[PDB]
């Protein structure tokens, strides 16, 4: 197949009259700027690479917005987490699949073309395994396929309630595997994910949930071809407990004990001191920034300006899914730095003064790296994952190049995304998804069941 | 005419099956819950009072998002302001009217049903008065009428470049009036605004732009019934300069020298120290918080939790119009408090633990007070300004009462606003405004002329 764009953001920058040839397997096979359409499909607006979503817990969308009730004068991340635990205790395999389908459809409409599902709900209601231990992982994969979104599934190793190998709590019963069972599940998933065109990654929930011994064991188990994700340094309490148990801060500890490199996505990394920021940047690991969730949970503001200045790599994740908006995450990534510094125009490069373009370039690259997928740019030999903005929008139509990105990211919104393609397949057209009605009906029923 | 809502937010709380009778003048004549439809038009979702927007500079929407380019390593409010001055120097009366109409249509679609236009663009390109001195004020009124939005026009007294009566800069030439001309403008405006069903307020740009004698003179002129608005304490430099000229901070100074009370809207008030916060709350003045613009400009975070705890009244304004979203302003008012305190659930009342409802209640009340209009409440005698949320949305349909406000404000977005009524007239239906097409055509042409 082929498509033709009056305007498109290519790796070398904005181009005009670009004809893209797309192979039968959904890969960009030829890209010719300043070309004739030559039989290709007419696109309706500015074309951008699709945005990877590098961190998701799908089921949490079912409770999004419901935890905004003061139950204490100092409501915490930890009281939120207990409510989340109560939600997860109720979910059937069928409900998990329905929620994921709805969520991924909404992600696609926002311009997220691929997702890293940080998946820790493994077992049945009593913590006992399913007949097929991969049951819930397979539901996630089936949901991604139905929506048509790219997927890196990250089954999560979760074993403990806290540092020192503290026994798992009752509320964590559905998450729990030892190292051996986890490595089995991981190996078991390779074939079905591959058959669906999906990717896999290694994942430790956090330094609270797994022991140093388990990390060492898993990293030595021969899955060197996979990304590695972990929640780290999100909350001050984790920092304090790490110090108590190890004499180090969380990121400091990880870097001292593990060969962190480009395979790694460090989710949140919120409490990173200057030495930790520098170590992250040196290593080439990707900071997984989840701006809307971090604000919602009162985590704090990441030192993004310091990190970026030193060549840090980052991407964005919707995480608890209170927000599903590429616009919101990038806008408030920048705005948070502005509020902290009380200055404007914080996140730019030495070779790129445009804020919107800086943010988009950064999150594309980091997102692609964290997912371990051939995405994040419109280049020959990368997958045909793209967005088409509204060519009829007066702001976008009057803008050119990087100014168009500024209008969208800082003055516009989600509904400026009109059409979306993933793996060379049209999955959103005129803001609508072919499965949205069926999904909404199933989803509203599930929401009722969960009350 | 009559409308019927299965769910509606009334002054006493959520109600069911409410029949509204609206008189010919757009005033709520009868409201009764637990009623039958009886030929009244059945509405398509949850009904809320429309949200007043208490602070706007219409023309700024034309440059929204365009000032996101790093020029300096420490770009500031002041370098932004210079770019804004360059934009304003080019605007014709026709262009101003076109931008205002487009903006107001977008406000309506977002759920803003009335706007306070803090209007300081008065004169021609060379600073000379128009044949009718009120020309540009009239363009604003005409635009609000065309869009169908409620309007409190705040013509702005602007006379100086800084404290001490510093002569106006060349860049400020279009804004400038002495006290005599300003007081004449107010009188000229009374009849046409009344004829259009619009309101009027007194307005000082800031303590930088007018002198203490000018303030006293204007306040002694007998317009004792009008709202009084002022930008105050937005930036540190204003605080420092006020201290240098008066030995006080800006808010401290105002409260020491002027009888501030319930008529007043203090826009931004960002740099309010604890004594200043207390005096604001005691006075019953409305804090005009413009969250998206304050973040965009790097102003900082208002002490909203301290203010609210003391009975403070607030409303929201879109200001520079980088964002036109009731959702975004209320959401990030709360999230800003969460990021600062590193805690959740910050803005609630002793009698209302629901965060969304607290925010909505507050901004409705402060917004109505600040505009001086009989709005912000679905009660008999108040104007029929309302929005209808999407009853087909699965998140909203599965929720009830205050939980529905939480889903919308914290998990949803603008797209969930479907129908909007102002003065008993439908101005948005199923997300569409009748003037949108003509408006966008004219607006895109203006955007081209401004480049
Ligand atoms: N935002 C954090 N969420 C985490 C909580 C945790 O780290 O325990 C989670 O979903 O597992
Ligand atoms: N956000 C601030 N804007 C103000 C600037 C000022 O106070 O000089 C204004 O548009 O007049
Ligand atoms: Hg499904
Ligand atoms: Hg589905
Ligand atoms: Hg540790
Ligand atoms: Hg107009
Ligand atoms: Hg118009
Ligand atoms: Hg002063
Ligand atoms: Zn997470
Ligand atoms: Zn303003």
Domain ranges across chain A: 1-50+374-431, 51-373+432-451
How many whole angstroms separate alpha carbon A179 and alpha carbon A327? 38
How many whole angstroms separate alpha carbon A152 and alpha carbon A193? 9
Q: Which atom of ligand 2 is nearest to the CA of B81?
A: 5
- Give the max Cα distance, chain A: 66
Q: A406 and B300 in contact by Cβ < 8 A?
A: no
The active-site residue, picked from B122, B123, B229, B268, is: B268
Show residues of chain A in contact with B360, CB under 8 Å: none
Neighbours of B316 (CB within 10 A): 30
User: A1-50+374-431 maps to which CATH number?
Assistant: 2.30.40.10
How many whole angstroms separate alpha carbon A100 and alpha carbon B233? 46
The pair of structure tokens assigned to A49 is: 């690479």
How many whole angstroms separate alpha carbon B272 and alpha carbon B261? 17
Search chain B and give the residue with CA nearest A309.
Answer: B73
How many whole angstroms separate alpha carbon A7 and alpha carbon B218? 54
Search chain B and give the residue with CA nearest A396.
Answer: B444
- Helices A274-283/A250-257 angle, 10° precision: 40
The pair of structure tokens assigned to A80 is: 């939120």
The pair of structure tokens assigned to B390 is: 């999407």
H or E segment and range at residue A119: strand A112-119
How many whole angstroms separate alpha carbon A117 and alpha carbon A141? 9
Report the Cα B157 to chain-centroid distance in Å.
18
Show residues of chain B in contact with A82, CB under 8 Å: none
How many whole angstroms separate alpha carbon A81 and alpha carbon B229? 43
H or E segment and range at residue A205: none
Q: Are B398 and B254 in contact (CB under 8 A)?
A: no
Show residues of chain A in contact with B443, CB under 8 Å: 394
Neighbours of B34 (CB within 10 A): 9
Q: Which of B233, B234, B236 should be mutated for ligand 2, with most atoms under 8 A from CB? A: B234
Report the Cα A53 to chain-centroid distance in Å.
3
Show residues of chain A in contact with B295, CB under 8 Å: 332, 335-336, 338-339
Residue A445 alpha carbon to ligand 4 centre in Å: 13
Task: Determine phi and psi for A294, rounding to 5 degrees.
Answer: -60, -40
Q: Is B319 a catalytic residue?
A: yes
* Cross-strand pairs, B10: B13
- Alpha-helix runs per DSSP H in B93-225: 93-110, 135-147, 179-195, 212-219
Q: Does the annotation place B231 within a ligand binding site?
A: yes
The string over A181-194, giving b where at least 16 C-beta atoms fall within 10 Å of a residue's C-beta and e elsewhere, is ebbebbebbeebbe
Q: Quick one: A142 exposed, middle or buried, by C-beta within 10 A (0-12, 13-18, 19+)?
A: middle
Give B16's contacts (C-beta < 8 A, 6+ positions apart): B6, B7, B33, B34
Report the Cα B277 to chain-centroid distance in Å.
21
Q: Are B289 and B304 in contact (CB under 8 A)?
A: yes
Q: Which of B156, B230, B231 should be mutated for ligand 2, with most atoms under 8 A from CB? A: B231
Q: Is A38 a catalytic residue?
A: no
How many whole angstroms separate alpha carbon B450 and alpha carbon B297? 22
Q: Which of B67, B76, B443 sits opposite A343 (nearest CB)?
A: B76
Residues with CB under 6 A from ligand 1: A 57, 81, 206, 231, 234, 293, 297, 319-320
How many whole angstroms separate alpha carbon B358 and alpha carbon B349? 7
The pair of structure tokens assigned to A281 is: 């940047």
Show residues of chain A in contact with B342, CB under 8 Å: 236, 298-300
Q: B406 and A65 in contact by Cβ < 8 A?
A: yes
Of B108, B92, B187, B193, the C-alpha closest to B147 is: B108
Q: Quick one: B208 exposed, middle or buried, by C-beta within 10 A (0-12, 13-18, 19+)?
A: buried
Search chain A and give the residue with CA nearest B328.
Answer: A328
Rounded to a whole number of angstroms, the CA Rg of chain B reads 21
Q: Are A373 and B259 in contact (CB under 8 A)?
A: no
The string over A428-445, giving b where at least 16 C-beta atoms fall within 10 Å of a residue's C-beta and e elsewhere, is beebebebbeebbebbbe
Q: How many residues make up chain B in this entry?
A: 451
Residue A242 alpha carbon to ligand 5 centre in Å: 4
Neighbours of A237 (CB within 10 A): 14
How many whole angstroms separate alpha carbon A129 and alpha carbon A176? 10
SS3 call for B364:
helix
Ligand number nearest to the C-alpha of A156: 1
Beta strand segments in A140-206, E: 150-155, 160-162, 166-167, 199-200, 202-204
Q: Quick one: B52 exposed, middle or buried, by C-beta within 10 A (0-12, 13-18, 19+)?
A: buried
The pair of structure tokens assigned to B335 is: 């999230």
How many whole angstroms separate alpha carbon B298 and alpha carbon A437? 42
Can you say whether residue B345 is alpha, beta or left, with left for phi > 0 and alpha for psi between -120 and 50 degrees?
Answer: left
Show residues of chain A in contact with B236, CB under 8 Å: 342
SS3 call for B218:
helix
Give A17's contacts (C-beta < 8 A, 6+ positions apart): A4, A5, A6, A33, A34, A35, A36
C-alpha distance across the termini of chain B, in Å: 46
Beta-sheet pairing, B51-56 with B112-119: parallel
Tell me, using a 6 A CB cutoff, whether residue B160 lines ligand 2: no
How many whole angstroms separate alpha carbon B271 and alpha carbon B281? 15
How many whole angstroms separate alpha carbon B71 and alpha carbon B84? 15
Beta-sheet pairing, B51-56 with B2-10: unpaired
Beta strand segments in B11-98, E: 13-22, 28-32, 41-42, 47-49, 51-56
Distance from CA of B48 to the nearest CA of A (A): 18
C-alpha distance across the termini of chain A, in Å: 46
- Helices A93-110/A135-147 angle, 10° precision: 30
Can you say whether residue A371 is alpha, beta or left, with left for phi > 0 and alpha for psi between -120 and 50 degrees?
Answer: alpha
Beta-sheet pairing, B313-316 with B386-389: unpaired
Expressed in percent and rounded to 5, the helix, strand and coil fractions of chain B are 40, 20, 35
Q: Are A383 and A45 in contact (CB under 8 A)?
A: no
Q: Which of A296, A394, A411 sits opposite B322 (nearest CB)?
A: A411
CA distances for A164 relative to A215, A216, A233, A260, B283, angstroms: 13, 15, 17, 21, 55
Q: Does the annotation place B321 within a ligand binding site?
A: no
Give A342's contacts (C-beta < 8 A, 6+ positions apart): B236, B298, B299, B300
Of A401, A278, A313, A321, the C-alpha closest to A106 is: A321
The pair of structure tokens assigned to B314 is: 């607030």
The pair of structure tokens assigned to A392 is: 């009829």
Beta-sheet pairing, B2-10 with B41-42: parallel
Q: Are A378 and A386 in contact (CB under 8 A)?
A: yes
How many whole angstroms separate alpha carbon B418 and alpha carbon B387? 7
Give B429's contacts (C-beta < 8 A, 6+ positions apart): B418, B419
Q: Quick one: A36 exposed, middle or buried, by C-beta within 10 A (0-12, 13-18, 19+)?
A: exposed
Q: Are B261 and B44 in contact (CB under 8 A)?
A: no
The pair of structure tokens assigned to B164 is: 């001490």
H or E segment and range at residue A79: helix A77-88
Of A178, A175, A264, A248, the C-alpha closest to A214 is: A178
Q: Are B266 and B251 in contact (CB under 8 A)?
A: yes
The active-site residue, picked from A268, A271, A321, A433, is: A268
CATH superfamily of A51-373+432-451: Metal-dependent hydrolases (3.20.20.140)
Within 13 Å of residue B185, how many CA atoms lie on the same side as its CB? 33
Distance from CA of B70 to the nearest CA of A (A): 5
The pair of structure tokens assigned to B185 is: 């403008």
- DSSP per residue, A209-231: TS-HHHHHHHHTSS-TTS-EEEE
- According to DSSP, residue B27 is labeled B
How many whole angstroms separate alpha carbon B189 and alpha carbon B81? 28
CA distances for B289 relative to A401, B361, B376, angstroms: 33, 15, 17
Q: Which of A231, A235, A292 should be mutated for ligand 1, with most atoms under 8 A from CB? A: A231
Q: Quick one: B25 exposed, middle or buried, by C-beta within 10 A (0-12, 13-18, 19+)?
A: exposed
CA distances for B267 relative to A411, B118, B280, B367, angstroms: 21, 10, 12, 12
The active-site residue, picked from B319, B385, B402, B419, is: B319
How many whole angstroms separate alpha carbon B449 and alpha carbon A322? 40
SS3 call for A355:
helix
Q: Quick one: B153 exposed, middle or buried, by C-beta within 10 A (0-12, 13-18, 19+)?
A: buried
Rounded to a whole number of angstroms, the CA Rg of chain A reads 21
Give A74's contacts (C-beta < 8 A, 6+ positions apart): B343
Q: A410 and B79 in contact by Cβ < 8 A?
A: no
Task: Determine phi and psi for B184, rounding to 5 degrees.
Answer: -65, -45
- Tell the residue number behind the tokens 């403070």, with chain if given: B312
Q: Which atom of ligand 2 is nearest to the CA of B84?
A: 10
The pair of structure tokens assigned to A179 is: 């190292």
Q: B398 and A448 in contact by Cβ < 8 A?
A: yes
How many whole angstroms separate alpha carbon A366 and alpha carbon A362? 6
Q: Are A373 and A383 in contact (CB under 8 A)?
A: yes
Q: Are A269 and A300 in contact (CB under 8 A)?
A: no
Q: Are B234 and B299 in contact (CB under 8 A)?
A: yes
Distance from CA of B315 to the nearest CA of A (A): 20
Give A406's contacts (C-beta < 8 A, 6+ positions apart): A354, A355, A356, A357, A399, B65, B66, B68, B69
- Give the max Cα distance, chain B: 67
Nominal resolution in Å? 1.9
H or E segment and range at residue B203: strand B202-204
Edge-to-edge order in the sheet of strand A264-268? A202-204, A228-232, A264-268, A286-289, A313-316
Q: Sign of dihedral through CA atoms A77, A82, A84, A85?
A: positive
The residue whose C-alpha atom lies closest to atom 8 belonging to ligand 2 is: B81
Q: Sign of dihedral through CA atoms A423, A318, A211, A181?
A: negative
């Amino acid at each position: 197949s082929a498509i033709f764009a009056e305007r498109a953001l290519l790796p070398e920058g904005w181009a005009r009259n670009v004809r893209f040839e797309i192979s039968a397997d959904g890969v960009l096979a030829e890209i010719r700027p300043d070309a004739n359409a030559d039989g290709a499909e007419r696109l309706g607006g500015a074309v951008l690479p699709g945005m990877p979503n590098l961190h998701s817990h799908a089921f949490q969308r079912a409770m999004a917005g419901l935890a905004e009730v003061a139950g204490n004068p100092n409501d915490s991340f930890w009281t939120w987490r207990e409510l989340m635990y109560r939600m997860v205790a109720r979910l059937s395999p069928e409900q998990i699949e329905v929620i994921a389908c709805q969520l991924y459809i909404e992600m696609l409409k926002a311009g997220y073309t691929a997702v890293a599902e940080f998946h820790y709900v493994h077992h049945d209601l009593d913590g006992r395994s399913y007949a097929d231990p991969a049951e819930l992982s397979l539901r996630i994969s089936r949901a991604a396929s139905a929506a048509g979104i790219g997927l890196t599934l990250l089954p999560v190793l979760y074993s403990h309630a806290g540092f020192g190998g503290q026994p798992a709590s009752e509320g964590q019963r559905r998450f729990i595997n030892g190292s051996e069972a986890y490595l089995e599940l991981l190996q078991r998933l390779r074939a079905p994910l591959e058959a669906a065109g999906h990717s896999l990654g290694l994942c430790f929930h956090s330094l609270r949930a797994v022991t140093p011994q388990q990390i060492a064991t898993v990293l030595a188990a021969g899955h060197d071809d996979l990304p590695v994700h972990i929640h780290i340094a999100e909350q001050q309490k984790e920092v304090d407990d790490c110090q108590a148990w190890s004499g180090r801060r969380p990121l400091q500890w990880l870097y001292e004990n593990v060969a962190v490199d480009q395979r790694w996505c460090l989710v949140h990394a919120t409490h990173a001191d200057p030495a930790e920021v520098a170590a992250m940047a040196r290593s080439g690991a990707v900071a997984g920034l989840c701006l809307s969730t971090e604000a919602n949970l009162g985590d704090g503001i990441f030192p993004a300006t310091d990190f970026l200045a030193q060549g840090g790599r980052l991407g964005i994740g919707s995480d608890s899914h209170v927000s599903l908006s590429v616009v919101e995450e990038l806008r408030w990534l920048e705005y948070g730095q502005r509020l902290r510094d009380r200055k404007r125009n914080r996140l730019y490069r030495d070779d790129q003064p445009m804020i919107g373009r800086t943010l988009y370039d950064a999150a594309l690259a980091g997102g692609a790296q964290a997912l371990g997928q051939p995405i994040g740019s419109l280049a020959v030999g990368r997958r045909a994952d793209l967005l088409v903005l509204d060519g009829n929008d007066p702001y976008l139509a009057s803008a050119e190049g990087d100014a168009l990105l500024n209008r969208w990211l800082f003055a516009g919104g989600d509904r400026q995304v009109r059409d979306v393609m993933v793996a060379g397949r049209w999955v959103v057209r005129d803001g609508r998804h072919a499965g949205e009605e069926r999904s909404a009906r199933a989803f509203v029923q599930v929401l009722g069941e969960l009350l």
